[PDB]
Structure 1
Amino acid sequence: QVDRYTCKTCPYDMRPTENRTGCRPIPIIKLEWGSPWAVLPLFLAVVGIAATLFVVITFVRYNDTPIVKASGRELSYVLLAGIFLCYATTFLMIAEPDLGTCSL
């Protein structure tokens, strides 16, 4: 501390500096989108969303050929929308924790 006569810890969340500056703010790390550590989930999620939308629009425009019949139709659309949501979970995780994001 700046205490000349009896030195003491700076509190939690507030870094020291044994110089004239006094204690200082601790750096706070977030999973910001600019991080190289988030580009892998970003890329995987975006390619998964693209694939899911492609399969959705393929069934939607081929909704009558016997192989989409064999796929069970709308139960398969429920499955594939579930995959879409499971992908969007990744987009939701990398965002700032905030309050609503942690709930979702």
Structure 2
Amino acid sequence: TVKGMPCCWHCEPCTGYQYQVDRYTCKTCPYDMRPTENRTGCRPIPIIKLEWGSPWAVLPLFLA
């Protein structure tokens, strides 16, 4: 954060959906992009297709 004196700053953490793009202000990346922990941008959201189907997909398969 830009303080009164341009001398000592204060890096206040942004929200969970805000990426540290610049050093003075955060930005917002599009959907399916989770902000990374480090200053790298936004990583893609891991998407699956229910291959195993253990919790609530093996009983329908067995009945079928």
TM-score bin (small chain): 0.5 to 0.7
Runs of 5+ unmatched residues, structure 1: 46-104
RCO comparison, higher one (Cα < 8 Å, 6+): 1
Runs of 5+ unmatched residues, structure 2: 1-18
Following TM superposition, where does structure 1 have runs of at least 4 consecutive aligned residues deviating by more than 4 angstroms? none
Q: Name the count of aligned residue pairs.
A: 44
The residue type equivalent to 2:42 in the other structure is C
Distance (whole Å) between structure 2 residues aligned to residue 4 and residue 18 of structure 1? 15
Determine the structure 1 residue equivalent to 2:50. 31
Determine the structure 1 residue equivalent to 2:4. none
Determine the structure 2 residue equivalent to 1:49. none
Distance (whole Å) between structure 1 residues aligned to residue 41 and residue 28 of structure 2? 11
Post-superposition CA distance 1:13-60 (Å, at most 9, x none):
11112413321011224232x120221111111xxxxxxxxxxxxxxx
Larger radius of gyration: 1
Identity of aligned residues (%): 91
Q: Which has the higher helix share?
A: 1
Within-5 A mapping of 1:22-101? 22-32=41-51, 34-36=52-54, 37-45=56-64
Distance (whole Å) between structure 2 residues aligned to residue 4 and residue 11 of structure 1? 20
CA RMSD of aligned residues (A): 1.8
Distance (whole Å) between structure 2 residues aligned to residue 29 and residue 40 of structure 1? 19
The residue type equivalent to 1:35 in the other structure is G
Q: CA deviation at 1:10?
A: 1.7
Distance (whole Å) between structure 2 residues aligned to residue 4 and residue 14 of structure 1? 20
| TM-score normalised by length of structure 2 | 0.52
